[PDB]
Amino acid sequence: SYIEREIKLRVISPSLEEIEERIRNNYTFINEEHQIDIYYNNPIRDFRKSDEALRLRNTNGKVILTYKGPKQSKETKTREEIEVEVSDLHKMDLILRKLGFIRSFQVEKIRKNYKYADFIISLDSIKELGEFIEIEGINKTEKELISFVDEFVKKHQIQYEKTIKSYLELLVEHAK
Amino acid sequence: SYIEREIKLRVISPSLEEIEERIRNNYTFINEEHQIDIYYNNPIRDFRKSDEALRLRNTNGKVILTYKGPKQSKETKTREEIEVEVSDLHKMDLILRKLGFIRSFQVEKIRKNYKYADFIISLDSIKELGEFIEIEGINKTEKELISFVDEFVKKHQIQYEKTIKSYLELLVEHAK
Ligand SMILES: Nc1ncnc2c1ncn2[C@@H]1O[C@H](COP(=O)(O)OP(=O)(O)OP(=O)(O)O)[C@@H](O)[C@H]1O
Ligand SMILES: Nc1ncnc2c1ncn2[C@@H]1O[C@H](COP(=O)(O)OP(=O)(O)OP(=O)(O)O)[C@@H](O)[C@H]1O
Ligand SMILES: [Ca+2]
Ligand SMILES: [Ca+2]
Ligand SMILES: [Ca+2]
Ligand SMILES: [Ca+2]
């Protein structure tokens, strides 16, 4: 069991490309991920009602199966997270479909990951949604994370809007 | 999707060690596997009633998740089989437990695998059950497999008893 604690910002201004130039100076680039996500649902235990999730992710060809627990926070996306890498995405999907899970929706993004003193800054560009930033802390308190995010946006003059809604949620509303 | 077609024999005589000496001459040894299996059940879809199975296997440290479909044969264990390798057994078990599956029973064995012209001969020693042999064919018909098994037992003077019951079943009955 690992506890995911992150803050998600919708970027109002400037673009991620401009933000990338402002942080390039003192933020060490890690890698870029092309992530295709398939979310599943248990027909008897709707994860939207229990606030859970089961996700099969393809990130640069690496296949990862992820369960996420209920949100334990209102100011950050605090959740239980358990992940394993699997050998074959198709056969993992088949097993899940054979076990009775149904594919709910798909999410796709390009994520650029930067690091800074136990903080993981992710520049997210979502297909048909827009540009977001996620900051995740390694063994950091909710106050430490909230405080750093405030410093990050001020230092780089970012106009933003916080949200604990997930990309999958944002994608649903945007459809209507 | 792959179709597992195998025949399972309970060895009456001689011991596997003696059989190993008789087949050593013209059967090429592959490897020896120490397999620890955890079987799961869906509380709403008892696999014993649907004739399915979900199994998390540790074979020489390699972790494999396996779904098996219903038996499509009465003279051989003909079943649908879908497998994927996962990175961590504990976390795969946790994910399954978090998704609602319950650990049904555990099975442990030492399996010696031999090969002979598209046939996989497995010498099985089961904890608290006994000695068995399984013969599995790669793209072989039910008649081809049945016929080869008859030749195998005759050539090596094996006293046996065929069965399509699974090790997990045999283990349950043996308890009473
Ligand atoms: N129908 C649904 N089934 C399951 N989970 C859902 C569903 N709708 C929304 N969710 C939510 O999807 C969320 C995805 O979280 P998030 O938006 O952070 O994804 P992500 O940023 O791509 O993930 P990560 O940050 O781990 O890379 C979960 O946090 C979960 O509640
Ligand atoms: N409670 C149960 N839940 C799920 N499956 C069960 C259960 N009881 C019995 N089974 C059966 O367990 C069987 C195991 O098959 P088998 O005995 O060939 O195992 P194995 O020889 O160890 O497997 P493999 O041959 O793939 O290595 C399945 O074939 C399945 O029906
Ligand atoms: Ca995250
Ligand atoms: Ca996230
Ligand atoms: Ca087999
Ligand atoms: Ca078998």
8 A C-beta contact, residue B127 and residue B110: no
Class of residue A83 by CB neighbours under 10 A (exposed 0-12, middle 13-18, buried 19+): middle
Q: Is B116 annotated as a binding residue?
A: no
β-partners of residue B130 are B126
Dist. CA A171–CA A175, nearest whole Å: 6
Mutate to test the pocket of ligand 2, among B2, B39, B135 (most ligand atoms within 8 A of CB): B39
Closest A-chain CA to B66: A95
Question: Does ligand 1 come within 6 angstroms of the Cβ of A132?
Answer: no
Helix (H) or strand (E) holding A63: strand A62-68
Nearest to A84 among B44, B92, B99 (CB): B92
Residue A70: DSSP 8-state: -
A84, A91, A92, A102: best to mutate for the B interface, most B CBs within 10 A: A84
Q: What number does the ligand 2 atom closest to the CA of B41 have?
A: 3
Q: How many residues does chain A have?
A: 176
Q: Which of A2, A39, A67, A116 is catalytic?
A: A39
> Which residues of chain B neighbour A84 with C-beta distances below 8 Å?
86-88, 91-92, 95
Dist. CA B96–CA B87, nearest whole Å: 14
Domain borders along chain A are: 1-176
Structure-token pair, residue B38: 């955890």
What is the CA(A95)–ligand 5 centre distance, in A? 18
SS3 (DSSP) at A128: coil
Q: Is A68 annotated as a binding residue?
A: yes
Dist. CA B159–CA A17, nearest whole Å: 74
Q: How far is CA B147 from CA B14, B94, B98, B121, B151, in A?
A: 21, 43, 45, 14, 6
Dist. CA B176–CA B171, nearest whole Å: 9
Resolution in angstroms comes to: 2.2
8 A C-beta contact, residue A75 and residue A163: no
Dist. CA B172–CA B176, nearest whole Å: 7
State the structure-solving technique: X-ray
Tell me the residue ranges of DSSP E strands in B60-158.
62-68, 77-85, 102-115, 119-126, 130-137
Ligand 2 pocket at CB < 6 A: B 39, 41, 47-48, 51, 53, 68, 77, 104, 134, 166-169
Q: Are B98 and A45 a contacting pair at CB < 8 A?
A: no
What is the CA(B133)–ligand 6 centre distance, in A? 9
Q: Which amino acid, A113?
A: N
Taking Cα atoms as reference points, which of A68, A44, A46 lies closest to residue A55? A68
Q: Are A86 and B65 a contacting pair at CB < 8 A?
A: yes
